[PDB]
PDB file of C-alpha atoms in Angstrom:
ATOM      1  CA  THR A  33      97.993   6.414 107.205  1.00 43.92           C
ATOM      2  CA  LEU A  34      95.847   9.313 107.733  1.00 41.86           C
ATOM      3  CA  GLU A  35      98.188  11.196 109.857  1.00 42.90           C
ATOM      4  CA  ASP A  36     101.189  11.189 107.748  1.00 44.02           C
ATOM      5  CA  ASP A  37      98.848  12.242 104.708  1.00 46.79           C
ATOM      6  CA  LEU A  38      97.431  15.254 106.714  1.00 45.12           C
ATOM      7  CA  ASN A  39     101.010  16.074 107.776  1.00 44.65           C
ATOM      8  CA  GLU A  40     101.983  16.473 103.931  1.00 45.04           C
ATOM      9  CA  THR A  41      98.793  18.115 103.219  1.00 46.84           C
ATOM     10  CA  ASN A  42      99.265  20.522 105.965  1.00 48.86           C
ATOM     11  CA  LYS A  43     103.179  21.121 104.813  1.00 46.06           C
ATOM     12  CA  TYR A  44     101.828  21.501 101.495  1.00 46.60           C
ATOM     13  CA  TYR A  45      99.343  24.226 102.301  1.00 44.60           C
ATOM     14  CA  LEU A  46     101.988  26.114 104.563  1.00 45.45           C
ATOM     15  CA  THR A  47     104.650  25.974 101.925  1.00 44.70           C
ATOM     16  CA  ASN A  48     102.194  27.246  99.293  1.00 43.87           C
ATOM     17  CA  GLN A  49     100.807  29.972 101.587  1.00 41.83           C
ATOM     18  CA  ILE A  50      97.077  28.792 101.230  1.00 44.54           C
ATOM     19  CA  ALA A  51      96.703  28.025 104.945  1.00 48.65           C
ATOM     20  CA  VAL A  52      98.446  27.530 108.300  1.00 51.30           C
ATOM     21  CA  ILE A  53      97.314  24.779 109.894  1.00 53.46           C
ATOM     22  CA  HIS A  54      99.245  22.606 112.573  1.00 48.02           C
ATOM     23  CA  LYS A  55      98.654  19.412 114.515  1.00 49.83           C
ATOM     24  CA  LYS A  56      99.139  20.030 118.222  1.00 51.86           C
ATOM     25  CA  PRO A  57     101.688  17.649 119.915  1.00 51.62           C
ATOM     26  CA  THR A  58     100.588  14.792 122.506  1.00 51.80           C
ATOM     27  CA  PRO A  59     100.361  16.472 125.996  1.00 51.88           C
ATOM     28  CA  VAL A  60     103.032  14.834 128.449  1.00 49.21           C
ATOM     29  CA  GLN A  61     102.429  15.497 132.149  1.00 50.09           C
ATOM     30  CA  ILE A  62     106.198  15.797 133.408  1.00 49.78           C
ATOM     31  CA  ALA A  78     107.201  11.453 132.674  1.00 49.49           C
ATOM     32  CA  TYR A  79     103.671  10.435 131.445  1.00 48.18           C
ATOM     33  CA  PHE A  80     101.035  10.345 128.378  1.00 46.27           C
ATOM     34  CA  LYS A  81      97.934  12.509 128.714  1.00 45.06           C
ATOM     35  CA  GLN A  82      94.622  12.806 126.988  1.00 47.78           C
ATOM     36  CA  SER A  83      94.393  16.323 125.663  1.00 49.16           C
ATOM     37  CA  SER A  84      90.903  18.040 126.152  1.00 51.85           C
ATOM     38  CA  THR A  85      91.076  19.592 122.546  1.00 54.19           C
ATOM     39  CA  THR A  86      90.941  18.336 118.882  1.00 54.22           C
ATOM     40  CA  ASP A  87      94.625  17.918 117.753  1.00 51.25           C
ATOM     41  CA  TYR A  88      94.315  20.371 114.396  1.00 49.08           C
ATOM     42  CA  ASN A  89      93.564  23.625 114.164  1.00 45.29           C
ATOM     43  CA  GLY A  90      94.671  27.101 112.304  1.00 44.19           C
ATOM     44  CA  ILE A  91      94.039  29.642 109.943  1.00 42.46           C
ATOM     45  CA  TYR A  92      92.460  30.233 106.456  1.00 43.68           C
ATOM     46  CA  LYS A  93      91.213  33.430 105.314  1.00 45.57           C
ATOM     47  CA  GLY A  94      90.766  34.919 108.476  1.00 44.67           C
ATOM     48  CA  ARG A  95      88.832  32.183 110.019  1.00 44.20           C
ATOM     49  CA  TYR A  96      89.709  29.671 112.622  1.00 41.15           C
ATOM     50  CA  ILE A  97      89.703  26.172 111.413  1.00 38.35           C
ATOM     51  CA  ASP A  98      89.502  23.190 114.060  1.00 37.59           C
ATOM     52  CA  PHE A  99      89.259  19.439 113.457  1.00 37.94           C
ATOM     53  CA  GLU A 100      90.167  15.880 114.451  1.00 38.73           C
ATOM     54  CA  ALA A 101      90.964  13.067 112.087  1.00 38.85           C
ATOM     55  CA  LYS A 102      90.312   9.563 112.548  1.00 36.82           C
ATOM     56  CA  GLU A 103      90.530   6.237 110.448  1.00 34.56           C
ATOM     57  CA  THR A 104      89.337   2.781 110.672  1.00 36.79           C
ATOM     58  CA  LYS A 105      89.613  -0.542 108.790  1.00 34.91           C
ATOM     59  CA  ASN A 106      86.306  -1.581 109.694  1.00 35.79           C
ATOM     60  CA  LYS A 107      84.198  -2.386 106.517  1.00 39.53           C
ATOM     61  CA  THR A 108      80.679  -1.707 107.995  1.00 40.26           C
ATOM     62  CA  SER A 109      80.805   1.239 110.231  1.00 38.96           C
ATOM     63  CA  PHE A 110      83.143   3.846 112.234  1.00 38.15           C
ATOM     64  CA  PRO A 111      83.307   3.349 115.821  1.00 37.84           C
ATOM     65  CA  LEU A 112      82.427   6.373 117.610  1.00 37.50           C
ATOM     66  CA  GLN A 113      84.746   5.773 120.642  1.00 36.89           C
ATOM     67  CA  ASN A 114      87.611   6.728 118.149  1.00 36.67           C
ATOM     68  CA  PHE A 115      86.713  10.237 119.647  1.00 38.22           C
ATOM     69  CA  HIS A 116      86.230  11.095 123.479  1.00 35.40           C
ATOM     70  CA  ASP A 117      83.822  13.603 124.989  1.00 37.71           C
ATOM     71  CA  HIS A 118      86.522  16.344 125.663  1.00 36.92           C
ATOM     72  CA  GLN A 119      86.841  16.560 122.017  1.00 37.11           C
ATOM     73  CA  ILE A 120      83.181  16.808 121.199  1.00 37.51           C
ATOM     74  CA  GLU A 121      82.703  19.383 124.042  1.00 37.00           C
ATOM     75  CA  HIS A 122      85.684  21.542 122.670  1.00 36.75           C
ATOM     76  CA  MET A 123      84.152  21.221 119.330  1.00 38.82           C
ATOM     77  CA  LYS A 124      81.023  22.428 120.650  1.00 37.92           C
ATOM     78  CA  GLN A 125      82.603  25.474 122.127  1.00 35.66           C
ATOM     79  CA  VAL A 126      84.282  26.327 118.939  1.00 34.76           C
ATOM     80  CA  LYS A 127      81.165  26.275 116.916  1.00 31.60           C
ATOM     81  CA  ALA A 128      79.496  28.615 119.710  1.00 32.94           C
ATOM     82  CA  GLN A 129      82.127  31.037 118.513  1.00 33.87           C
ATOM     83  CA  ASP A 130      81.385  30.557 114.910  1.00 33.01           C
ATOM     84  CA  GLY A 131      84.591  28.533 113.958  1.00 32.62           C
ATOM     85  CA  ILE A 132      84.737  26.249 111.133  1.00 35.05           C
ATOM     86  CA  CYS A 133      84.902  22.791 112.752  1.00 33.11           C
ATOM     87  CA  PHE A 134      84.436  19.183 111.526  1.00 32.28           C
ATOM     88  CA  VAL A 135      86.233  15.877 111.317  1.00 33.47           C
ATOM     89  CA  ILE A 136      87.875  14.013 108.770  1.00 32.59           C
ATOM     90  CA  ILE A 137      87.288  10.327 108.726  1.00 39.19           C
ATOM     91  CA  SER A 138      89.135   7.844 106.449  1.00 38.78           C
ATOM     92  CA  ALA A 139      86.926   4.784 106.115  1.00 41.25           C
ATOM     93  CA  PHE A 140      85.756   2.403 103.472  1.00 37.87           C
ATOM     94  CA  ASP A 141      88.351   3.234 100.945  1.00 38.57           C
ATOM     95  CA  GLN A 142      87.439   7.043 101.392  1.00 34.02           C
ATOM     96  CA  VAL A 143      87.966   9.965 103.087  1.00 33.58           C
ATOM     97  CA  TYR A 144      85.333  12.337 104.558  1.00 34.66           C
ATOM     98  CA  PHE A 145      84.679  15.618 105.727  1.00 35.34           C
ATOM     99  CA  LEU A 146      82.033  15.583 108.393  1.00 35.75           C
ATOM    100  CA  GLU A 147      80.552  18.849 109.825  1.00 32.24           C
ATOM    101  CA  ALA A 148      80.629  19.163 113.504  1.00 34.67           C
ATOM    102  CA  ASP A 149      76.774  19.588 113.797  1.00 32.19           C
ATOM    103  CA  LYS A 150      76.324  16.243 112.141  1.00 29.56           C
ATOM    104  CA  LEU A 151      79.153  14.439 114.346  1.00 30.72           C
ATOM    105  CA  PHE A 152      77.025  15.956 117.129  1.00 31.47           C
ATOM    106  CA  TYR A 153      73.755  14.110 115.797  1.00 27.49           C
ATOM    107  CA  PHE A 154      75.699  10.721 116.170  1.00 27.92           C
ATOM    108  CA  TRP A 155      77.478  11.471 119.353  1.00 26.38           C
ATOM    109  CA  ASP A 156      74.260  12.622 121.278  1.00 28.26           C
ATOM    110  CA  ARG A 157      72.215   9.420 120.181  1.00 29.15           C
ATOM    111  CA  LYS A 158      74.867   6.636 120.919  1.00 31.99           C
ATOM    112  CA  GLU A 159      73.569   5.987 124.550  1.00 29.60           C
ATOM    113  CA  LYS A 160      69.652   5.829 123.711  1.00 28.56           C
ATOM    114  CA  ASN A 161      69.958   2.339 121.586  1.00 28.82           C
ATOM    115  CA  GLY A 162      73.640   1.422 121.654  1.00 30.46           C
ATOM    116  CA  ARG A 163      74.455   3.128 118.071  1.00 27.45           C
ATOM    117  CA  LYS A 164      78.158   3.282 119.077  1.00 27.86           C
ATOM    118  CA  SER A 165      79.003   3.453 115.127  1.00 24.87           C
ATOM    119  CA  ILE A 166      78.231   5.551 112.082  1.00 20.33           C
ATOM    120  CA  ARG A 167      77.339   3.184 109.503  1.00 24.40           C
ATOM    121  CA  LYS A 168      78.776   3.567 105.939  1.00 21.47           C
ATOM    122  CA  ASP A 169      75.404   4.678 104.234  1.00 22.06           C
ATOM    123  CA  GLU A 170      74.872   7.091 107.386  1.00 21.53           C
ATOM    124  CA  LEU A 171      78.385   8.431 106.706  1.00 17.49           C
ATOM    125  CA  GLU A 172      77.599   8.999 102.850  1.00 14.95           C
ATOM    126  CA  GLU A 173      74.537  10.568 103.408  1.00 16.54           C
ATOM    127  CA  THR A 174      76.017  13.170 106.051  1.00 13.73           C
ATOM    128  CA  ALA A 175      79.606  13.864 105.111  1.00 11.55           C
ATOM    129  CA  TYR A 176      81.511  15.219 102.016  1.00 10.02           C
ATOM    130  CA  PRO A 177      84.076  13.045 100.014  1.00 10.16           C
ATOM    131  CA  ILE A 178      87.215  14.966 100.054  1.00 11.84           C
ATOM    132  CA  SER A 179      89.380  14.562  96.761  1.00 13.79           C
ATOM    133  CA  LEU A 180      92.377  12.531  97.445  1.00 15.07           C
ATOM    134  CA  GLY A 181      95.670  13.516  95.248  1.00 13.84           C
ATOM    135  CA  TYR A 182      99.140  13.792  94.822  1.00 12.77           C
ATOM    136  CA  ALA A 183      99.657  17.220  96.327  1.00 12.41           C
ATOM    137  CA  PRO A 184      97.736  18.095  98.466  1.00 11.70           C
ATOM    138  CA  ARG A 185      97.106  14.448  99.577  1.00 13.67           C
ATOM    139  CA  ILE A 186      93.843  15.297 101.158  1.00 13.73           C
ATOM    140  CA  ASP A 187      92.184  18.503  99.785  1.00 15.24           C
ATOM    141  CA  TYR A 188      89.770  19.240 102.620  1.00 17.78           C
ATOM    142  CA  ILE A 189      90.558  23.114 102.123  1.00 16.40           C
ATOM    143  CA  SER A 190      88.617  22.797  98.999  1.00 16.92           C
ATOM    144  CA  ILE A 191      85.551  21.618 100.921  1.00 18.77           C
ATOM    145  CA  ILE A 192      85.795  24.498 103.631  1.00 18.49           C
ATOM    146  CA  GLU A 193      85.921  26.864 100.397  1.00 22.47           C
ATOM    147  CA  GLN A 194      82.831  25.130  98.796  1.00 18.53           C
ATOM    148  CA  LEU A 195      80.894  25.389 102.142  1.00 21.75           C
ATOM    149  CA  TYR A 196      82.040  28.680 103.381  1.00 19.36           C
ATOM    150  CA  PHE A 197      83.503  30.920 100.865  1.00 21.80           C
TER     151      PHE A 197
ATOM    152  CA  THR B  33     103.639  34.024 137.009  1.00 21.48           C
ATOM    153  CA  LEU B  34     102.463  34.656 133.545  1.00 23.61           C
ATOM    154  CA  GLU B  35     101.681  31.042 132.575  1.00 19.21           C
ATOM    155  CA  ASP B  36      99.472  30.204 135.391  1.00 18.93           C
ATOM    156  CA  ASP B  37      97.542  33.470 135.057  1.00 18.27           C
ATOM    157  CA  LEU B  38      96.938  33.147 131.206  1.00 17.16           C
ATOM    158  CA  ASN B  39      95.774  29.382 131.998  1.00 18.37           C
ATOM    159  CA  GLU B  40      93.096  30.716 134.562  1.00 14.17           C
ATOM    160  CA  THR B  41      92.432  33.505 132.093  1.00 14.47           C
ATOM    161  CA  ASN B  42      91.775  31.270 129.271  1.00 12.39           C
ATOM    162  CA  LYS B  43      89.461  28.943 131.555  1.00 12.24           C
ATOM    163  CA  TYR B  44      87.620  31.851 132.423  1.00 11.12           C
ATOM    164  CA  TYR B  45      86.877  33.076 128.929  1.00 15.32           C
ATOM    165  CA  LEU B  46      86.141  29.500 128.080  1.00 14.40           C
ATOM    166  CA  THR B  47      83.520  28.836 130.832  1.00 16.55           C
ATOM    167  CA  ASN B  48      81.655  32.003 129.929  1.00 14.31           C
ATOM    168  CA  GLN B  49      81.892  31.293 126.237  1.00 13.03           C
ATOM    169  CA  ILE B  50      83.857  34.262 125.564  1.00 11.74           C
ATOM    170  CA  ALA B  51      86.567  32.811 123.602  1.00 11.40           C
ATOM    171  CA  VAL B  52      88.377  29.456 122.917  1.00 12.40           C
ATOM    172  CA  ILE B  53      92.042  29.558 123.640  1.00 10.21           C
ATOM    173  CA  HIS B  54      94.482  27.249 124.682  1.00 10.69           C
ATOM    174  CA  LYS B  55      98.113  26.987 125.436  1.00  7.40           C
ATOM    175  CA  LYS B  56      99.645  24.308 123.130  1.00  7.33           C
ATOM    176  CA  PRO B  57     101.565  21.543 125.016  1.00  4.83           C
ATOM    177  CA  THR B  58     105.517  21.633 124.827  1.00  2.00           C
ATOM    178  CA  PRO B  59     106.725  19.166 121.971  1.00  6.02           C
ATOM    179  CA  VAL B  60     108.789  16.544 123.163  1.00  9.67           C
ATOM    180  CA  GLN B  61     110.941  13.420 121.808  1.00  8.10           C
ATOM    181  CA  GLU B  77     113.380   8.541 127.185  1.00  7.37           C
ATOM    182  CA  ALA B  78     112.910  11.987 128.333  1.00  8.89           C
ATOM    183  CA  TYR B  79     114.032  15.061 125.810  1.00  7.49           C
ATOM    184  CA  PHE B  80     112.318  18.842 125.182  1.00  7.47           C
ATOM    185  CA  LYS B  81     112.117  19.958 121.646  1.00 10.06           C
ATOM    186  CA  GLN B  82     111.822  23.438 119.980  1.00  8.71           C
ATOM    187  CA  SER B  83     108.359  24.259 118.588  1.00 10.59           C
ATOM    188  CA  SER B  84     108.168  25.950 115.257  1.00 10.42           C
ATOM    189  CA  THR B  85     104.916  27.995 116.347  1.00  7.77           C
ATOM    190  CA  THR B  86     103.607  29.960 118.938  1.00  6.52           C
ATOM    191  CA  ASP B  87     102.089  28.568 122.112  1.00  7.21           C
ATOM    192  CA  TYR B  88      98.807  30.050 121.982  1.00  7.24           C
ATOM    193  CA  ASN B  89      95.928  30.061 119.731  1.00  8.95           C
ATOM    194  CA  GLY B  90      92.175  29.730 119.438  1.00 12.16           C
ATOM    195  CA  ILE B  91      89.073  31.499 118.559  1.00 11.58           C
ATOM    196  CA  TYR B  92      87.142  34.676 119.098  1.00  8.44           C
ATOM    197  CA  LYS B  93      83.998  35.962 117.396  1.00 10.19           C
ATOM    198  CA  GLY B  94      84.955  33.919 114.338  1.00 10.22           C
ATOM    199  CA  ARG B  95      88.633  34.927 114.193  1.00  9.34           C
ATOM    200  CA  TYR B  96      91.629  33.288 114.618  1.00 11.24           C
ATOM    201  CA  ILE B  97      93.864  34.449 117.742  1.00 12.39           C
ATOM    202  CA  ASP B  98      97.290  33.771 118.036  1.00 11.23           C
ATOM    203  CA  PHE B  99     100.029  34.681 120.435  1.00 11.41           C
ATOM    204  CA  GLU B 100     103.219  34.189 122.571  1.00 11.17           C
ATOM    205  CA  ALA B 101     103.649  35.258 126.034  1.00 11.10           C
ATOM    206  CA  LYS B 102     106.786  36.130 128.050  1.00 12.71           C
ATOM    207  CA  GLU B 103     108.284  37.639 131.107  1.00 14.60           C
ATOM    208  CA  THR B 104     111.441  39.164 132.400  1.00 15.42           C
ATOM    209  CA  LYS B 105     113.152  40.251 135.467  1.00 14.85           C
ATOM    210  CA  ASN B 106     115.179  43.061 133.862  1.00 13.44           C
ATOM    211  CA  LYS B 107     114.165  46.685 134.842  1.00 10.38           C
ATOM    212  CA  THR B 108     115.048  48.690 131.433  1.00 14.45           C
ATOM    213  CA  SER B 109     114.725  46.461 128.430  1.00 11.20           C
ATOM    214  CA  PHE B 110     113.014  43.313 127.025  1.00 12.44           C
ATOM    215  CA  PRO B 111     115.594  40.839 125.861  1.00 12.11           C
ATOM    216  CA  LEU B 112     114.218  40.166 122.359  1.00 12.13           C
ATOM    217  CA  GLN B 113     115.916  36.695 122.531  1.00 10.84           C
ATOM    218  CA  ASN B 114     112.872  35.793 124.599  1.00 12.20           C
ATOM    219  CA  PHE B 115     111.251  34.819 121.392  1.00 12.74           C
ATOM    220  CA  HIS B 116     112.881  32.960 118.437  1.00 18.00           C
ATOM    221  CA  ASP B 117     112.949  33.096 114.652  1.00 16.02           C
ATOM    222  CA  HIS B 118     110.315  30.238 114.051  1.00 13.27           C
ATOM    223  CA  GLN B 119     107.907  32.025 116.269  1.00 10.88           C
ATOM    224  CA  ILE B 120     108.189  35.354 114.391  1.00 12.82           C
ATOM    225  CA  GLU B 121     107.857  33.793 110.869  1.00 13.04           C
ATOM    226  CA  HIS B 122     104.768  31.823 112.235  1.00 11.28           C
ATOM    227  CA  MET B 123     103.453  35.230 113.397  1.00 13.22           C
ATOM    228  CA  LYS B 124     104.113  36.820 109.921  1.00 13.73           C
ATOM    229  CA  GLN B 125     102.275  33.994 108.346  1.00 13.60           C
ATOM    230  CA  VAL B 126      99.415  34.389 110.584  1.00 16.78           C
ATOM    231  CA  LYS B 127      98.808  38.315 110.144  1.00 16.40           C
ATOM    232  CA  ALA B 128      99.290  37.865 106.244  1.00 17.86           C
ATOM    233  CA  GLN B 129      96.396  35.059 106.693  1.00 18.90           C
ATOM    234  CA  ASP B 130      94.448  38.312 108.304  1.00 18.64           C
ATOM    235  CA  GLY B 131      94.491  36.630 111.594  1.00 16.69           C
ATOM    236  CA  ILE B 132      94.799  38.412 115.158  1.00 15.90           C
ATOM    237  CA  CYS B 133      98.434  38.087 116.139  1.00 15.36           C
ATOM    238  CA  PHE B 134     100.270  39.592 119.109  1.00 15.12           C
ATOM    239  CA  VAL B 135     102.379  39.175 122.095  1.00 14.69           C
ATOM    240  CA  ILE B 136     101.947  39.662 125.797  1.00 12.43           C
ATOM    241  CA  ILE B 137     104.906  40.924 127.706  1.00 11.27           C
ATOM    242  CA  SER B 138     105.181  40.969 131.363  1.00 14.13           C
ATOM    243  CA  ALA B 139     107.802  43.261 132.305  1.00 15.06           C
ATOM    244  CA  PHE B 140     108.856  46.383 134.456  1.00 17.80           C
ATOM    245  CA  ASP B 141     105.819  45.397 136.907  1.00 22.08           C
ATOM    246  CA  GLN B 142     103.313  45.694 134.080  1.00 19.89           C
ATOM    247  CA  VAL B 143     101.636  43.629 131.317  1.00 17.66           C
ATOM    248  CA  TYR B 144     101.408  44.557 127.734  1.00 17.61           C
ATOM    249  CA  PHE B 145      99.687  43.738 124.466  1.00 18.79           C
ATOM    250  CA  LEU B 146     102.214  44.587 121.736  1.00 18.46           C
ATOM    251  CA  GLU B 147     100.614  43.963 118.204  1.00 17.28           C
ATOM    252  CA  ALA B 148     102.496  41.694 115.883  1.00 16.68           C
ATOM    253  CA  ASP B 149     103.476  44.347 113.308  1.00 18.79           C
ATOM    254  CA  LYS B 150     105.324  46.438 116.099  1.00 18.19           C
ATOM    255  CA  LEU B 151     107.200  43.351 117.286  1.00 18.08           C
ATOM    256  CA  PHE B 152     108.534  42.681 113.822  1.00 19.55           C
ATOM    257  CA  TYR B 153     109.628  46.232 113.545  1.00 19.64           C
ATOM    258  CA  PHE B 154     111.845  45.526 116.574  1.00 18.16           C
ATOM    259  CA  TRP B 155     112.876  42.130 115.286  1.00 14.34           C
ATOM    260  CA  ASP B 156     113.381  43.389 111.663  1.00 15.61           C
ATOM    261  CA  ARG B 157     115.799  45.963 113.094  1.00 13.63           C
ATOM    262  CA  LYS B 158     117.436  43.193 115.478  1.00 13.39           C
ATOM    263  CA  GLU B 159     120.291  41.889 113.097  1.00 16.72           C
ATOM    264  CA  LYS B 160     120.334  45.023 110.982  1.00 17.44           C
ATOM    265  CA  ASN B 161     121.769  47.224 113.310  1.00 16.17           C
ATOM    266  CA  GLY B 162     122.124  46.605 116.909  1.00 16.69           C
ATOM    267  CA  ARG B 163     119.258  47.045 119.044  1.00 19.71           C
ATOM    268  CA  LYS B 164     117.995  43.292 120.330  1.00 21.70           C
ATOM    269  CA  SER B 165     115.994  44.982 123.014  1.00 19.31           C
ATOM    270  CA  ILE B 166     112.714  46.794 123.400  1.00 22.31           C
ATOM    271  CA  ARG B 167     113.377  49.685 126.078  1.00 23.53           C
ATOM    272  CA  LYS B 168     110.843  50.453 128.543  1.00 24.73           C
ATOM    273  CA  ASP B 169     109.916  53.688 126.909  1.00 23.45           C
ATOM    274  CA  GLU B 170     109.951  51.834 123.609  1.00 19.41           C
ATOM    275  CA  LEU B 171     107.200  49.282 124.927  1.00 18.52           C
ATOM    276  CA  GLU B 172     105.470  52.172 126.741  1.00 20.22           C
ATOM    277  CA  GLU B 173     104.910  53.727 123.305  1.00 21.54           C
ATOM    278  CA  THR B 174     104.024  50.869 121.228  1.00 22.75           C
ATOM    279  CA  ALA B 175     102.218  48.329 123.178  1.00 23.04           C
ATOM    280  CA  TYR B 176      98.757  48.704 125.378  1.00 25.29           C
ATOM    281  CA  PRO B 177      98.765  48.028 129.238  1.00 29.26           C
ATOM    282  CA  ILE B 178      96.734  45.181 129.924  1.00 31.04           C
ATOM    283  CA  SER B 179      94.171  45.500 132.911  1.00 31.98           C
ATOM    284  CA  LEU B 180      95.101  42.948 135.682  1.00 30.38           C
ATOM    285  CA  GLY B 181      91.885  41.587 137.475  1.00 30.43           C
ATOM    286  CA  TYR B 182      90.414  38.863 139.648  1.00 33.56           C
ATOM    287  CA  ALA B 183      87.941  37.814 136.603  1.00 37.23           C
ATOM    288  CA  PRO B 184      90.001  37.129 133.803  1.00 35.63           C
ATOM    289  CA  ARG B 185      93.261  37.941 135.527  1.00 36.83           C
ATOM    290  CA  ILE B 186      94.769  39.318 132.139  1.00 36.09           C
ATOM    291  CA  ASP B 187      92.152  40.820 130.231  1.00 39.13           C
ATOM    292  CA  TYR B 188      93.501  40.570 126.719  1.00 38.23           C
ATOM    293  CA  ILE B 189      90.283  40.020 124.950  1.00 37.02           C
ATOM    294  CA  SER B 190      89.099  43.525 125.901  1.00 36.14           C
ATOM    295  CA  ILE B 191      91.807  44.917 124.083  1.00 36.93           C
ATOM    296  CA  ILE B 192      91.255  42.370 121.066  1.00 35.96           C
ATOM    297  CA  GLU B 193      87.768  43.879 121.486  1.00 39.57           C
ATOM    298  CA  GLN B 194      88.810  47.639 121.014  1.00 41.54           C
ATOM    299  CA  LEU B 195      91.284  47.156 118.236  1.00 40.59           C
ATOM    300  CA  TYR B 196      89.505  44.851 115.911  1.00 40.31           C
ATOM    301  CA  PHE B 197      85.709  45.025 116.886  1.00 42.17           C
TER     302      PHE B 197
END
């Protein structure tokens, strides 16, 4: 489960003073569950604002785009206009991928022209970066941020 | 009320692409409230991570430091050590002040040590910057972040 794995990654980065990244809790209107209008994960690494969402699927062929909603994407685009580090982490096809926000916007924006509602495996492998899994941290997405931004 | 005003302030910054800052949802447990281990505001302005807490008081002489809590202060230490912009917004004595995180560590680290588990009107008036109240941003804390850091 991606969410547990990111909890333990995030604790590991905090505890070792590498980064300070938290998952925002589910909103509750006071009671009922609401739909957040942002991504769930944000925080700081080396001065910079880091913002992402994280989704997994068991589909063997493609990642359904509806795992995300428009408010997430719109927030991500607002983050990008402020020069934030913003992306998604996708667990699919026995791997875990870091997909830059620009690339996710490409897939999101074309989903209405021809019914392309999923990112195919080959489409994801071409556009996204495999993240190295280990024991600790579990999902080392900060090393991708280091490679691409520092 | 500080919380509605910061909401409108943050929507205004968002709408005009000045910054992307949100209050995080309060964590909950069938109906129970839980203590958050971070501050309630964070986001991005001009590439940088922004993080803050905001509190009000009636009281006319002094600001009770137990308006904050240990976990919040430790989070802020972490944030500042990560070279983020961190601070608090205090609504008191019919004014609104931006108090840099360093200054508030001062008062907090001298909290258990000997006695002084308040910031006295005059104490705040010397350490923290008055915030311009307005129609537009209701609470123009970014102006002050912009002076101090840019």
